[PDB]
Amino acid sequence: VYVGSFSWWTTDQQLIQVIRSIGVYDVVELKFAENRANGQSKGYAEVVVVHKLLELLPGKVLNGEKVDVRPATRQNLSQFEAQARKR
């Protein structure tokens, strides 16, 4: 699963609490896309547990913006990466 887009100060802790409030406690690991040069978050994350997050998580507002959740594929990573640098 991929989630985003959100601001660069949206934390892994904030993202986790929003995931628990829909009923996903089976999260293994969060990994943010980051600028490697300076460590800045690119505003999206790969979440690793699925269909609970695809369904109930979108339509939630995190630090102002609405989250788009979609399944982890190459197709969906290019869309979030293209969206990242459209900012």
Added chain:
Amino acid sequence: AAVYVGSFSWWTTDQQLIQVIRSIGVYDVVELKFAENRANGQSKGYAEVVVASENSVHKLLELLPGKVLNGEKVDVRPATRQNLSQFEAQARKREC
């Protein structure tokens, strides 16, 4: 008017060069410009000595060659493009 002086170690100082120049009777040095690696400021072991007068350039060319800076005898030549090329080639050849 100017000359190139070299070659010498990277720890040969501005003060040491000015003192040897004073020792041959030259007191109108307008600028001492060491050849340097721009990235880190290290001296490449030669310098341009700019003086106010041709009298001082004549003295530098006659009296300075052979003088010793930190164990090395220095060469001194007129500051021409050809001589700059030759000092820089020598410095590049030392860097190895």
Added chain:
Amino acid sequence: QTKPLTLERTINLYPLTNYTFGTKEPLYEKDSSVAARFQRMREEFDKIGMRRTVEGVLIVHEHRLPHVLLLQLGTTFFKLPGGELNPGEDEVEGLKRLMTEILGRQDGVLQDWVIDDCIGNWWRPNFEPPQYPYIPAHITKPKEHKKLFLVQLQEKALFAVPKNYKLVAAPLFELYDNAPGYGPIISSLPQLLSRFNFIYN
């Protein structure tokens, strides 16, 4: 505190929302060209000696991260507030004077600058742009000594910026490894600030 201050130095940061920003009359550089810059440096070197510059690093916090206040001229040029010390002037008193000249209020109400920490030193070996955080071994007479200080801010303050400049709060990640954008001195600040234990008030 339990540890020596040399081993652990704690600094209070306040949020950017605690601060306000105005503008005042433009403040123009003493030198109108690079050529004129180095000519004056040369003349002052002969008449007085090494130029002594002090600059202040003023830090706020926003979104979890320290931000340094920078003066921006135009698109691409950035500098720290500071300037030249007078002959014999104390470094700290001199930086307070300069900060007041640059960011002080027109209504006469003084800022209270607190300056207790040197963060680095940069040296100009020649009458030329390059500066290094050490004196090259062949240079016994550097032409400029630039000293950087952390300036601890009051909980709240109004800064009046000369209108030819913009004041920007740059997060440390924007500066880090960005010498092309900010030059070697500003781009090194993340490293130089890393030792501080910052309290995010």
Added chain:
Amino acid sequence: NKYIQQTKPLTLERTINLYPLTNYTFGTKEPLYEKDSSVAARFQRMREEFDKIGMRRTVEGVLIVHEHRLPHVLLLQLGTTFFKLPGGELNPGEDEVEGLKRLMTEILGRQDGVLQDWVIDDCIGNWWRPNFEPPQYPYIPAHITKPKEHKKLFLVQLQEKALFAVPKNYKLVAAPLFELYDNAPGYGPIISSLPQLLSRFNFIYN
């Protein structure tokens, strides 16, 4: 019995005595091998341990000498182009400074009975590793609440003379600050920023 001395003036201006490179010598001891020699092994152990004890805490020492009135940083060279500072991992709850003293004695401590005395009064900087990957930064990125490694650097003041014992598979070398400066490709981001980190110190060239 002794006379009561005046206070040493309290200032955050730090003055540090340096001594000539040739005041320091070394003998050889038995080779040293780090816990991990491969990248993949490094990060596997870091993951495993992170689950057990939490954030890795590393401490490293910066030992400074001078030649030609330029400070030189002592480095451990393990390969043509592979350098590290003396240091390593703290044990659980171990004090940062006492831990660095242990690590330094383990790596460089003289083997002939005379106890090495490390003077460690100065923190130089901090680097954080946000993930189980190579990047480290001099700050914690705003989105990271749980960094995987915190590395702290300290200036270690040397006595006028010292004998070290160096593991035989290492070399101990003295890097002029101009060799490190802007040389992240050769030395990495931590070592290459030591010139900047040391610039605040008032060095005395004895």
